[PDB]
């Protein structure tokens, strides 16, 4: 039996965080998995173009930041950059 992938449990937990009293359909969970897929793919393609228009092959978080604020529209993007940056601080401040 080949082991297949999903992101269902993760975003499921996130949904339980932001709304404890809320159910969901299974197809919509698949939709959100496809959503994460699509956003990830556009980001990664912008990362590869970041590489080739920078002639470098290392990926750091700075490239991810500039990729996100290339793709996403402004206000949403800056909030997301804030969330990611504070997470970078909280992780890399410890181990």
């Amino acid at each position: 039996r080949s082991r297949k992938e999903s992101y269902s449990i993760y975003v499921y937990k996130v949904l339980k965080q932001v709304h404890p009293d809320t159910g969901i359909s299974s197809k919509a969970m698949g939709i959100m998995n496809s959503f994460v897929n699509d956003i990830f793919e556009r980001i990664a393609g912008e990362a590869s173009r970041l590489a080739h228009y920078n002639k470098r092959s290392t990926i750091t978080s700075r490239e991810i930041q500039t990729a996100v604020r290339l793709l996403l529209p402004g206000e949403l993007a800056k909030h997301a950059v804030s969330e990611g940056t504070k997470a970078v601080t909280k992780y890399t401040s410890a181990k």
Binding site: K27, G30, I31, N33, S34, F35, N37, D38
Partner: protein
């Protein structure tokens, strides 16, 4: 053939579009544009399955062909 498209089907298409009043030649014009749409879609879908060396077109290949025409559709594992 193409005449399996009923008049009230394209009428329901106007209704979910929200369109009120309907002319005559609309029906055959609709069937034609739908045909060319499905032609390009299923052509490159069968191209995907040709590379797959397999005798059934995958739903995955349908999804990727929609991506290839810039028509990205979620929902069915894409």
């Amino acid at each position: 053939n193409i005449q399996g498209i009923t008049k009230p089907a394209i009428r329901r298409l106007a209704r979910r579009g929200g369109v009120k009043r309907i002319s005559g030649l609309i029906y055959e014009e609709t069937r034609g544009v739908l045909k060319v749409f499905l032609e390009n879609v299923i052509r490159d879908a069968v191209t995907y399955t040709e590379h797959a060396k397999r005798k059934t077109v995958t739903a995955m290949d349908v999804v990727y062909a929609l991506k290839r025409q810039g028509r990205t559709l979620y929902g069915f594992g894409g």
